[PDB]
Amino acid sequence: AMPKERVDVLAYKQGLFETREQAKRGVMAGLVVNVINGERYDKPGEKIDDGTELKLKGEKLRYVSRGGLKLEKALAVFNLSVEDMITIDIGASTGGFTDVMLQNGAKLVYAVDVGTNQLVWKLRQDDRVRSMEQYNFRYAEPVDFTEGLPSFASIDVSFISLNLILPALAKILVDGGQVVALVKPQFEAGREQIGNGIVRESSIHEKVLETVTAFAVDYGFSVKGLDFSPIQGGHGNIEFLAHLEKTDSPQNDVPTSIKEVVAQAHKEFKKNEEE
């Protein structure tokens, strides 16, 4: 049978809370609910299938996983359409971003992940989806994408820098194609700048965004916009959203915006905590 884990620990592992102790308190406070049926968990130690998608009480969620909220925000704040497009979801995991793109009219989604048996079957088996698991995107070649190259890409990967994804993406994405990238300071910052794998400092967030935007341009992408992700990554990490475009004349359209985006992010997460 599917292995089982405590609800509280699973909520922590999925990033709903920053620590296991906070997760236990959160379940006790009725804050953890099942994504599929919306029912609250009452016992922190209830053992459930380790594939169970969880969310916080009151999160309005249309997708198979809470991570879809990240791409949902990005499509709205960058005014992006995927209607009738061939798209690629890099780091597809259980399917949140793929689901977002299907619901927003994508013609085809290549759902790429380095893991095994992650994508939920309703998405795997969708006529618009091409699941490509056990696939390391750093080694992508255009021949692998047999139904057409994509014109839109989403990236949400862990334990690797975008520095290792963007050059591969430049081989696969069509010229003029748009990208939404999750920029995760905990996987971008120097080993010296990372505190339990947590980057708390607004100054290090700014430096990460400067570094990432610069290498995006090096690899042939304009930076068209920046925002912050609506939910935290693991261990309370604030994450950012970057809107890129593949172009022969790349530039950073928003150099002076980094300090403000980092400030807004810290404000929103400070006011979320106090609430």
Distance CA 235, CA 241 (A): 18
Cα 10–chain centre separation? 18
Pick from 182, 202, 200: nearest CA to 263: 202
Euclidean distance between CA atoms 268 and 168, whole angstroms: 33
Q: Say how far apart CA 70 and CA 55 lie, in whole Å.
A: 13
| Amino acid letter for position 25 | R
- Looking only at the bridges linking them, the beta strands covering 86-90 and 108-112 are parallel
CA distance 240 to 231: 10
**Domain definitions of the chain by residue range:** 1-65, 66-275
The answer to whether 261 and 108 have CB atoms below 8 angstroms apart is no
Contact 181, 157 (CB under 8 A): no
- What CATH homologous superfamily does 66-275 map to? Vaccinia Virus protein VP39 (3.40.50.150)
Q: Is the dihedral of CA 168, 257, 200, 67 positive or negative?
A: negative
Least Cα distance to 150 among 168, 138, 126, 123 occurs for 168
Fold designation for 1-65: 3.10.290
In 3D space, the residue among 67, 267, 252, 224 whose CA is nearest the CA of residue 158 turns out to be 67
Distance between CA 118 and CA 97 in Å, rounded? 13
CA angle 219, 135, 115 (to 5 degrees): 120
CB-based contacts of 236, cutoff 8 Å, min separation 6: 18, 198
